[PDB]
Specification:
Elements lengths: L13 E7 L2 H4 L12 H7 L8 E6 L9 H14 L14 E7 L14 H10 L3 E7 L9 H15 L2 E5 L6 H5 L7 H9 L3 E6 L8 H13 L5 E7 L2 H4 L16 H4 L5 H12 L5 E5 L1 H4 L1 E2 L2 E2 L1 H16 L5 H7 L2 E4 L34 E2 L6 H5 L7 E4 L8 H11 L9 E5 L2 E5 L9 E7 L2 E7 L4 E7 L2 E7 L15 H5 L6 H11 L10 E8 L6 E7 L8 E5 L4 E8 L2 E7 L4
Parallel strand pairs: 1-2, 1-8, 2-3, 3-4, 4-5, 5-6, 6-7, 7-8, 11-12, 11-13
Antiparallel strand pairs: 9-10, 14-15, 15-18, 16-17, 17-20, 18-19, 19-24, 20-23, 21-24, 22-23
PDB class: hydrolase
Keywords: hydrolase, blood group antigen
Assembly: monomeric
């Protein structure tokens, strides 16, 4: 093995920072990115605490579809990255880069990435120590005849150089199963047997109408636990709102795939944190987002989604490393071997732990994410682990998985019920993680959680997650319900028919909207109420270390009922929030 260029694991997570080449300006002799970020300016802006965990991911977007264009753009940017000087110290501090080398099946009618040979990639790794890896993303809809062969070559050239091959893909059309050899294309399967320590496999939740969120995430987790990938994660994509035909928040009717640029702006900001929790709580460590103009920002400025949700979430997962592989193995009671594509795809988990066919969220944490690997793979390495002895490894074709009711009856024997209420909750050590799982329905949810004898009842509106940590002197609370008002995008449409018919916002129009109405002059959402009730408290708790999104919260209300030894906490906010409550139990 060649020394790794960087670590990627629970203690060293990875946030990918995408930059999409502006092919129109490339044709004019300029080297620029859609949305106006510059490589140097963006890197400088990244908070210093996050720099060790963040990597710039270049994407060739609409560079001309001809030989040399992607090499030219990429070599220019690698040079800029390599020559970077820290303005505060004067030291050359090369910027870490990941290159997108494969997308859309690398068809020459789809992408300039077609004209990037393995030879060139090898040359770039050798020339640039700051090239930390290469990325393949989104070919499930165009599964090229040689995709497994090419993926084997990407993994091998990365291993040769100590870099990572990162593949973000969704199990549409059995893509993950095929990647590992379902249909007899076994080159990548063989590559992984040798080079899995240089592989990162991520879900890509874009094709949301096909409902493969839960099954793809199950595979990513299972691949990791069984030593078929070094680590896993997810690319969470606000374009899901387009794929599923949604429009104005909470509005009725479906507009189909008709208003792309309005649609990818509409997903609530905090819902990206809800999605990202599925990665974190299950031991994933790599995070990436789309659409980047919304999720990260424009013109070297952080969007509010980035500053108030993603930045804070990512800081959290650095401060509190995700459960290790060993820990997740120890906690795993059931591990599925087999193909979800033959058991209803995402339907497998509907009314088990997801509430509908098309959602990136879960409705219960009772089973967390049940890990699986495709039927083509073997569980030998999993069984060889010292931490896997109490795992039931079950074929997906087992009678236990034959129906929705069979799945719950089996899983319920092994995963005890550990909270009450119709809301998502999952416990990790002394922490309850809670969110309202509604996607586009304006419905409050409630749950009853316990920390031993201490009872905590919560009431959450949609697009609200919380982390509640029992600490020696009381409770640490992190709450995020940040959701701005996107109704302006849907002005002039009083129903779905009218909304489908709106003028296109367009790509350039959306970037302009972000500049003019999101980066500044933001239409913030209304403050909304969260209730937390604690039962079993000695005296009125005290509040400490209260902070959050500027101007986004009223002072929390503490109402102590001495007779019933209980406190009702009322919060009215829209943003991120954190505080400690100090108290003793009764």
């Amino acid at each position: 093995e060649v020394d790794k260029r960087r670590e990627i694991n629970n203690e060293h997570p990875l946030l990918m920072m995408p930059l999409y080449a502006n092919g129109e300006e490339f044709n004019q002799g300029k080297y620029t990115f859609w949305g106006g970020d510059t490589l140097t300016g963006k890197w400088e802006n990244i908070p210093d605490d996050l720099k060790p965990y963040t990597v710039i991911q270049l994407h060739p977007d609409d560079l001309p579809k001809r030989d040399g264009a992607a090499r030219d753009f990429y070599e220019h940017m690698l040079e800029e990255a390599a020559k970077y000087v820290n303005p505060k110290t004067g030291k050359n501090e090369p910027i870490p880069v990941i290159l997108t080398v494969y997308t859309a099946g690398n068809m020459p009618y789809h992408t300039s990435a077609h004209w990037l040979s393995t030879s060139w990639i090898d040359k770039m790794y050798q020339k640039y120590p700051n090239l930390h890896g290469i990325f393949s993303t989104e070919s499930y809809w165009i599964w090229a005849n040689d995709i497994e062969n090419k993926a084997a070559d990407y993994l091998k050239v990365s291993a040769k150089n100590g870099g990572y091959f990162i593949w973000a893909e969704q199990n549409s059309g059995s893509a993950i199963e095929k990647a590992f050899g379902k249909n007899g294309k076994i080159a990548f399967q063989k590559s992984v047997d040798k080079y899995w320590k240089n592989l990162i496999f991520m879900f890509k939740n874009t094709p949301a109408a096909e409902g493969n969120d839960s099954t793809t995430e199950s595979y990513m987790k299972g691949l990791w636990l069984s030593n078929h990938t070094y680590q896993w994660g997810g690319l969470m994509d606000t374009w899901k709102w387009y794929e599923t035909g949604k429009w104005k928040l909470f509005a009725s009717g479906n507009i189909g795939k008709s208003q792309g640029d309005r649609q990818w702006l509409t997903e609530p900001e905090s819902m990206l944190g809800e999605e990202a929790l599925g990665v974190y709580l299950n031991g994933g460590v790599v995070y990436n987002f789309e659409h980047p103009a919304y999720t990260y920002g424009v013109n070297n400025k952080e969007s509010l989604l980035f500053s108030e949700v993603i930045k804070e979430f990512f800081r959290y997962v650095i401060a509190h490393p995700a459960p290790s592989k060993e820990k997740v193995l120890e906690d795993t009671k059931v591990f599925i071997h087999g193909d979800y594509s033959n058991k209803g795809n995402g339907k497998f988990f509907v009314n088990v732990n997801t509430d509908r066919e098309q959602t990136p969220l879960y409705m219960t944490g009772r089973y967390n994410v049940i890990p699986a690997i495709p039927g083509v793979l073997k569980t030998d390495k999993l069984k060889e682990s010292v931490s896997s002895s109490r795992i039931q490894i079950k074929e997906i074709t087992s009678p236990e998985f034959s129906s929705t009711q069979a799945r719950k009856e089996y899983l319920n024997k092994l995963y005890p019920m550990n909270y009450e209420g119709d809301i998502f909750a999952q416990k990790l050590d002394n922490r309850w993680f809670v969110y309202n799982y509604k996607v586009n329905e304006n419905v409050k949810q409630t749950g009853k959680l316990k920390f031993n004898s201490l009872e905590m009842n919560v009431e959450f509106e949609p697009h609200t997650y919380g982390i509640f940590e029992r600490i020696s002197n009381g409770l640490k609370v992190n709450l995020n319900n940040f959701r701005t008002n996107k109704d302006s995008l849907w002005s002039n449409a009083q129903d779905a028919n009218q909304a489908k018919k709106l003028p296109q916002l367009t790509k350039k129009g959306a970037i302009k909207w972000i500049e003019e109405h999101y980066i500044k002059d933001t239409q913030f959402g209304e403050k909304r109420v969260t209730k937390i009730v604690l039962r079993g408290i000695d005296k009125l708790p005290t509040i400490h270390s209260l902070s959050g999104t500027n101007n986004s919260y009223d002072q929390p209300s503490l109402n102590f009922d001495q007779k019933n030894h209980m406190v009702t906490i009322t919060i009215n906010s829209n943003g991120n929030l954190e505080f400690e409550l100090h108290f003793l139990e009764h």
